[PDB]
């Protein structure tokens, strides 16, 4: 029954994204990662909703973790260079 | 004076076994006061109120909770074992853990013996029911 | 009878001798261990010599 | 039966358990046995077995000689305890048949002190100590004896004055007055001389300087792809534990001469270790063949002892092949060819070294012996070599 | 707490703890030293 | 034979080292004069409240030797039993049975054992759905036992106020020495929580226990504007009502000093001079190579003992030197010599020591260290014990250069090396592996370093 439960969680994350809350969704994405499901696009969703809350360091680490799991075309590296430009702005 | 060296020998042997007994008793009790994981537990104590005077649910709950502790403990044993060999855990805490892991299996067999007093053959599956009830605390 | 000593002097060419500093790291520790066991063994017999005659 | 500790002891407690095991062994040494001329089993053994004479350690450390050589588990304890009962009966009925109950009590208290010494061996051996058991007490008695000779308050009556024993004379003669008192300190021979202790410090420094010599064979392992380390081959190889044993057999022949002397005076000796340089030139032949006897015997007993005991190239070649070690420098299967060249010359020359120190010490005149000082400082340096690891 | 104490009362043996040995040794030493004083009655 | 007499001529004189005692690359401290300037006297006197006896023993020994020489110059009861049984029977079996008692209460780091069991019970019921902040670990510290033996009558729910007041820079007034001993014994306890949490393969409690010591020794709360609040002259209301999104040290440094006096509200040139000085000497890092070296040979192999090597470069308030412009073959490549190939890590022992840190709001004196963790990105768990690195070179951060924000000699730029060993060996199946290594400060907020390393193993014939 667990794939139906985690799919319900993912659809709930989808609707919470359409509503526009950004911190709300992170509490369930970290829940989904601590549950035991590892996927490529979930890291991108977590890093995006963490970047919209403007926390740089954990977003960069989440992009790096998504690099460390699997390679993805043009999703990881654009987010990584965007967060790198953001951190270059942040440090000066 | 033939009694006197055997008097000496008798005194020394009886004082040796007396000191071994006193040392073994104090060393056992000072282990059996030390704290442990899952304190404040009361299911074994709540069973006595129903066993005083419909009770099969309490039997089910005690057996299910004990085997839930068994699953968690046979998960948790290498971690506290490595924390014993590594250097940071008390000597006495790890021994108290070593007593707890035997105590839960004694409770596991005693609850089955207490289960067969009304002779149900539920026992052969009843442990696994605990698994899905943890699902209710899961999600 | 001398070629064996020639093997000896061949052996004594490859050996990491203790240095000026290294040997004084050895002799400090061995000296304090030996002086401690010797002082213990001396004081014990000096304590026990009066007990002994008194014990009779 | 002492419970072994489940995790390894840190160093700070590992030192204190030794430092109180010694302090209980010595007090077990000097307590007078209850229920008691010049005769003995004989004088030579005491240095081999590390015991006082006439106390409740007169049985010696030889209890733990048993359960080591017996096994060479509770049945080990009971076989050592009945062998102790036999040896105690031998010592009490051969040594100093007056009465029964004193004898019955003597057997009992020798049995109990034997049990205590066998217990402290197991305590230090299981892991609370930092070394073996037999080695530590036989270092301690040698250290206590050479400090008892070097400083003591014991006086000498019946002579010309009240003479002291040791380096107490150097300060005591400051009181009596003129400049011959230094010469009177340095050369007189009825008491141990201060010239002898100024030589004792010298031989004690020289053996430490020799103890560090080694040969580093460079290893590049290949089973687990790393760990490029050394293999040390010491010059003082086989830890000179047969050599004392060698002297033991030397000492053991002496038991048969005394037996013959007390059994039959009629019949149908230079091999004793000579004591002085003055009578060394009395006979030029006998001292020369004596030092060749000691040198050749130490060399050949070490040359055997590599073969019969543990460490030999026929076994160490196998110990390199199974443990995965491979010597540097394109030595693929020439480990035997490399190692047979270097190891037995190390062993034989080390045996000759120990023998040369053995005869030069006692010719030179030293408080103790060559074998005593060497057996002490080898095991103290062993303690330092194990602890270096820290 | 009681169950843990029982665990050590139903499964025991006769081994010794490494602090007991010094107690035994000072007891035996003082037994003999004490014994000599009986001859000083 | 029968001979006994005490008080010999020389027995006292022979036993009776003062003369021997009489016969018996650095990193500079910018802050050592400065650190006592910004402290109050309640901290200074508390330090001040917290050798020559051998010279006294030599004096008494010389006087006793002279008295014995004067005693020689005049020429030129069963009570001993009852003390011996008192000296051997009662005394000796007592202290050891105390000693083996007391050193059975501790553990390898120096924590009492009920605190260790307290942390493992505190940790075993932690759910992931709780968020770890600084207040949670400030609670779990407050449940401890070592604070109870320092002050008996206080309660654990009462200790947390005494320890919250140090973070938010309040003053209890009455209990100040108590709070001082609490924040002194914060350190050995917090590394105890770190060492328990690294056994459970738990990451967030480890990062929290590093962040809490980051917060204690500077006394600032968990704020996203924290980087400027460690600076030793600030007006909090002026920085929060200016509401300038500076939010770090580099963005504070990239603008002019008149604007610094504006945005910090500082008006004195000496105070602003000291503030810009300490804002200069705050060490950030940047990696230049992150390698998996093996001592034997060039390529990692399906059962190998690798150790990891970082080539770090300390800098602050300077523009980034390009990763090409430094010479790759000179300093970044290690020697291959056998006497430095048996044990590589002693190369790290050649380096200097870290200077004294600057913390006025902390009681004792602190040499700044650098904690470092490793972790597996396959699952996300910790992998070994944390390691504390305390030998690096701050010569790069010196006050001599001060010209980046054109001589530019490449010799002076110190490149520091960090080596971390792996207690685990390599994996078995050949293929790409990913690791994640963190290395964090312990005394300032500066810049952490959480990089990843692609352990590419191959097969070498």
Swiss-Prot record, chain A:
UniProt keyword annotations, A-Z: Cytoplasm, Protein transport, Transport
Protein location: Cytoplasm
Entry superkingdom: Eukaryota
Cysteines joined through disulfide linkages: none
Any GO BP: post-translational protein targeting to membrane, translocation
Keyword Transmembrane helix assigned: no
GO molecular function, one term: protein transmembrane transporter activity
Record bears the keyword Ion transport: no
Cellular component terms (Gene Ontology): endoplasmic reticulum; rough endoplasmic reticulum membrane; Sec62/Sec63 complex; translocon complex
Note from the entry: Present with 5290 molecules/cell in log phase SD medium.
Assembly notes: Component of the heterotetrameric Sec62/63complex composed of SEC62, SEC63, SEC71 and SEC72. The Sec62/63 complex associates with the Sec61 complex to form the Sec complex. May interact with protein YLR301W. Part of a complex consisting of KAR2, SEC63, SEC66 and SEC72.
Task of the protein: Acts as a non-essential component of the Sec62/63 complex which is involved in SRP-independent post-translational translocation across the endoplasmic reticulum (ER) and functions together with the Sec61 complex and KAR2 in a channel-forming translocon complex. A cycle of assembly and disassembly of Sec62/63 complex from SEC61 may govern the activity of the translocon.
Protein's name in the database: Translocation protein SEC72
Source taxonomy: Eukaryota, Fungi, Dikarya, Ascomycota, Saccharomycotina
Full-length numbering of the shown residues: 101 to 192 of 193
Swiss-Prot record, chain C:
Molecular-function GO terms, alphabetical: protein transmembrane transporter activity; structural molecule activity
Parts of the chain on the Extracellular side: 52-56
Compartments where found: Endoplasmic reticulum membrane
Principal subcellular localisation of the protein: endoplasmic reticulum
Alphabetically ordered keywords of this record: Endoplasmic reticulum, Membrane, Protein transport, Translocation, Transmembrane, Transmembrane helix, Transport
Regions that span the bilayer: 23-51
Keyword Disulfide bond: no
Protein topology in the membrane: Single-pass membrane protein
Biological-process GO terms, alphabetical: post-translational protein targeting to membrane, translocation; SRP-dependent cotranslational protein targeting to membrane; SRP-dependent cotranslational protein targeting to membrane, translocation
GO cellular component assignments: endoplasmic reticulum; endoplasmic reticulum membrane; nuclear inner membrane; rough endoplasmic reticulum membrane; Sec61 translocon complex; Ssh1 translocon complex; translocon complex
Family designation: Belongs to the SecE/SEC61-gamma family.
Quaternary state and interactors: Component of the heterotrimeric Sec61 complex, which is composed of SSH1, SBH1 and SSS1. Presumably three to four Sec61 heterotrimers assemble into an oligomeric ring with a central aqueous pore. In cotranslational ER import, the pore diameter varies from 9-15 A in a ribosome-free resting state to 40-60 A in a functional state when associated with the ribosome. The Sec61 complex is part of a channel-forming translocon complex whose composition seem to change dependent upon different functional states.
Protein name, per record: Protein transport protein SSS1
Swiss-Prot record, chain D:
Keywords assigned by UniProt, alphabetized: Endoplasmic reticulum, Membrane, Protein transport, Translocation, Transmembrane, Transmembrane helix, Transport
Residue ranges annotated as Cytoplasmic topological domain: 121-165, 211-240, 307-341
Single GO MF annotation: signal sequence binding
Segments on the Lumenal side according to the record's topology features: 37-54, 97-99, 178-190, 360-362
Protein name per UniProt: Protein transport protein SEC61
Subcellular location per the Swiss-Prot or TrEMBL entry: Endoplasmic reticulum membrane
Example of a GO biological process term: post-translational protein targeting to membrane, translocation
One CC-aspect GO term: translocon complex
Swiss-Prot record, chain F:
Region (2 X 11 AA repeats): 318-360
Residue intervals of the SEC63 domain: 85-389
Pfam families, per the entry: DnaJ (PF00226)
InterPro entries with a match to the protein in the record: DnaJ_domain (IPR001623), DnaJ_domain_CS (IPR018253), Ig_E-set (IPR014756), J_dom_sf (IPR036869), Sec63-dom (IPR004179)
Coiled coil: none
Membrane topology: Multi-pass membrane protein
Annotated consequence of substituting residue 288 to N: Temperature-sensitive
SMART domains: DnaJ (SM00271), Sec63 (SM00973)
Gene Ontology cellular component terms for the protein in this record: endoplasmic reticulum; mitochondrion; nuclear inner membrane; rough endoplasmic reticulum membrane; Sec62/Sec63 complex; translocon complex
GO MF annotation, one: protein transmembrane transporter activity
Membrane topology, Cytoplasmic segments: 25-56, 97-461
Superkingdom per UniProt: Eukaryota
SUPFAM superfamilies according to UniProt: Chaperone J-domain, E set domains, Sec63 N-terminal domain-like
Location in the cell: Endoplasmic reticulum membrane; Nucleus membrane; Nucleus inner membrane
Primary location recorded for the protein, binned into one broad class: endoplasmic reticulum
Swiss-Prot/TrEMBL Sequence repeat ranges: 318-328, 350-360
Sorted UniProt keywords: Chaperone, Endoplasmic reticulum, Membrane, Nucleus, Phosphoprotein, Protein transport, Repeat, Transmembrane, Transmembrane helix, Transport
Modifications the protein undergoes after translation, according to the UniProt entry: Phosphotylated by casein kinase II.
Transmembrane residue ranges: 57-72, 78-96
Result of altering residue 283 to L: Temperature-sensitive
Single GO biological process annotation from the record: cytosol to endoplasmic reticulum transport
Location of Phosphoserine modifications: 369
Misc remark: Present with 17700 molecules/cell in log phase SD medium.
Name under which the protein is recorded: Protein translocation protein SEC63
Organism (species): Saccharomyces cerevisiae (strain ATCC 204508 / S288c)
């Amino acid at each position: 029954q667990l794939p139906e439960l985690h799919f319900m969680l993912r659809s709930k994350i989808d609707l919470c994204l359409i509503l526009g809350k950004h911190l709300e969704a992170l509490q369930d994405l970290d829940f989904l990662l601590g549950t035991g499901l590892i996927q490529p696009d979930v890291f991108v969703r977590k890093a995006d909703c963490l970047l919209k809350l403007r926390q740089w360091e954990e977003a960069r680490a989440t992009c790096e973790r998504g690099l460390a799991l699997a390679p993805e075309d043009m999703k990881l590296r654009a987010l990584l260079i965007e967060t790198a430009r953001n951190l270059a702005e942040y440090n000066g | 004076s033939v009694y006197t060296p055997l008097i000496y020998v008798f005194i020394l042997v009886v004082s040796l076994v007396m000191f071994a007994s006193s040392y073994r008793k104090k060393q056992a009790k000072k282990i059996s006061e030390q704290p442990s994981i899952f304190d404040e537990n009361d299911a074994h104590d709540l069973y006595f109120q129903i066993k005083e005077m419909v009770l099969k649910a309490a039997l089910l709950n005690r057996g299910a909770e004990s085997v839930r502790r068994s699953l968690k403990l046979k998960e948790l044993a290498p971690q506290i074992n490595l924390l014993y060999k590594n250097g940071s855990i008390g000597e006495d805490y790890w021994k108290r853990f070593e007593t707890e892991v035997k105590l839960i299996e004694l409770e596991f067999k005693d609850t089955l013996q207490e289960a067969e007093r009304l002779q149900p053959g539920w026992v052969q599956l009843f442990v696994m029911v605990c698994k899905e009830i943890c699902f209710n605390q899961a999600l | 009878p001398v070629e064996f000593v020639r093997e000896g002097t061949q052996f004594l060419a490859k050996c990491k001798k203790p240095d000026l500093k290294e040997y004084t790291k050895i002799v400090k520790a061995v000296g304090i261990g030996f002086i401690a066991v010797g002082i213990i063994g001396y004081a014990i017999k000096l304590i026990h010599i009066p007990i002994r005659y008194v014990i009779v | 039966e002492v419970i072994a500790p489940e995790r390894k002891v840190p160093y700070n407690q590992k030192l204190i358990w030794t430092g109180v095991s010694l302090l209980i062994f010595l007090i077990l040494g000097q307590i007078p046995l209850y229920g008691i001329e010049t005769s003995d089993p004989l004088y030579w053994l005491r240095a081999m077995l590390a015991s006082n004479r006439g106390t409740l350690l007169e049985l010696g450390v030889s209890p733990i000689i048993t359960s080591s050589m017996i096994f060479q588990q509770i049945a080990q304890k009971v076989c050592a305890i009945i062998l102790i009962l036999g040896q105690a009966l031998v010592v009490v009925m051969t040594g100093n048949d007056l009465g029964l109950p004193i004898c019955l009590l003597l057997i009992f208290q020798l049995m109990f002190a034997s049990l205590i010494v066998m217990l402290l061996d197991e305590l230090l051996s299981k892991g609370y100590g930092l070394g073996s058991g037999i080695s530590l007490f036989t270092a301690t008695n040698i250290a206590e004896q050479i400090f008892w000779r070097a400083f003591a308050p014991t006086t000498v009556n019946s002579g010309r004055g009240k003479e002291f024993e040791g380096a107490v004379i150097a300060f005591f003669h400051l009181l009596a007055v003129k400049k011959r008192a230094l010469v009177e300190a340095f050369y007189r021979t009825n008491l141990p001389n201060m010239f002898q202790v100024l030589m004792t410090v010298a031989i004690f420094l020289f053996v430490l300087y020799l103890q560090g010599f080694r040969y580093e064979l460079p290893i590049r392992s290949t089973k687990v792809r790393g760990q490029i380390g050394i293999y040390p081959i010491k010059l003082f190889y086989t830890s000179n534990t047969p050599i004392m044993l060698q002297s033991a057999l030397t000492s053991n022949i002496f038991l048969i001469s005394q037996i013959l002397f007390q059994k039959y005076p009629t019949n149908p000796y230079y091999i004793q270790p000579l004591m002085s340089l003055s009578e060394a030139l009395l006979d030029p032949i006998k001292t020369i063949v004596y030092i060749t006897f000691v040198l050749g015997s130490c060399a050949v007993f070490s040359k055997t002892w590599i073969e019969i005991s543990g460490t030999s190239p026929r076994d160490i070649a196998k110990q390199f092949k199974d443990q995965g070690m491979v010597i540097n420098g394109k030595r693929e299967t020439s480990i035997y060819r490399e190692l047979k060249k270097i190891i037995p010359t190390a062993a034989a020359f080390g045996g000759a070294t120990i023998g040369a120190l053995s005869v030069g010490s006692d010719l030179l005149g030293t408080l103790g012996s060559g074998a005593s000082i060497l057996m002490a400082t080898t095991t103290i340096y062993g303690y330092y070599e194990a602890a270096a690891k820290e | 707490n009681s169950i843990l104490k029982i665990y050590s009362d139903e499964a025991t043996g006769l081994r010794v703890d490494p602090l007991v040995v010094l107690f035994l040794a000072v007891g035996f030493i003082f037994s003999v030293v004490a014994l000599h004083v009986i001859s000083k009655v | 034979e029968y001979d006994e007499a005490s008080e010999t001529w020389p027995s006292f004189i022979l036993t009776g080292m003062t003369l021997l005692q009489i016969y018996q690359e650095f990193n500079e401290e910018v802050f050592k004069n400065l650190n006592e300037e910004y402290t109050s006297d309640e901290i200074k006197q508390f330090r001040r409240k917290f050798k020559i006896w051998s010279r006294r023993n030599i004096i008494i020994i010389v006087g006793w030797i002279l008295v014995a020489i004067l005693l020689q110059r005049i020429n030129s009861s069963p009570l001993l039993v009852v003390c011996y049984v008192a000296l051997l029977g009662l005394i000796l079996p007592y202290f050891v049975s105390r000693w083996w008692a007391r050193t059975q209460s501790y553990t390898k780091k120096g924590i009492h054992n009920v605190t260790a069991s307290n942390f493992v019970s505190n940790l075993v019921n932690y759910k992931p759905s709780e968020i770890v902040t600084t207040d949670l670990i400030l609670h779990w510290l407050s449940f401890a036992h070592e604070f109870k033996q320092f002050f008996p009558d206080l309660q654990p729910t009462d200790f947390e106020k005494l320890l919250q007041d140090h973070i938010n820079r309040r003053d209890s007034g009455k209990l100040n020495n108590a709070k001082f001993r609490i924040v002194a014994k914060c350190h050995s306890l917090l590394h105890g929580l770190l060492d328990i949490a690294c056994g459970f393969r738990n990451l967030d409690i480890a990062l929290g226990a590093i962040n809490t010591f980051k917060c204690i020794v500077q006394a600032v709360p968990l704020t996203p504007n924290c980087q400027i609040l460690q600076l030793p002259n600030v007006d909090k209301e002026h920085f929060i009502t200016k509401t300038g999104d500076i939010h770090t040290l580099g963005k504070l440094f990239t603008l002019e000093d008149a604007k610094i006096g504006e945005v910090l509200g500082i008006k004195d040139q000496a105070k602003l001079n000291e503030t810009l000085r300490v804002a200069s000497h705050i060490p950030n890092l940047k990696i230049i190579k992150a390698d998996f070296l093996v001592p034997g040979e060039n390529q990692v192999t399906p059962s190998s003992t690798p150790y990891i090597s970082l080539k770090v470069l300390v800098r602050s308030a300077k523009q980034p030197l390009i990763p090409t412009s430094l010479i790759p073959e000179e300093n970044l490549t290690e020697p291959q010599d056998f006497e430095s190939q048996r044990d590589p890590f002693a190369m790290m022992s050649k380096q200097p020591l870290v200077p004294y840190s600057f913390a006025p709001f902390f009681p004792t004196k602190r040499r700044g260290s650098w904690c470092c963790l490793v972790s597996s990105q396959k699952d996300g768990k910790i992998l070994q014990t944390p390691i504390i690195i305390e030998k690096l070179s701050y010569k790069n951060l010196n006050d001599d250069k001060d010209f980046f924000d054109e001589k530019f000699d490449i010799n002076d730029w110190e490149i520091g090396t960090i080596k971390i060993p792996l207690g685990q060996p390599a994996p078995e199946t050949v293929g790409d592996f990913f690791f994640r290594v963190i290395v964090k400060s312990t005394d300032y907020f500066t810049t952490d370093l959480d990089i990843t390393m692609n352990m590419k193993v191959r097969d070498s014939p």
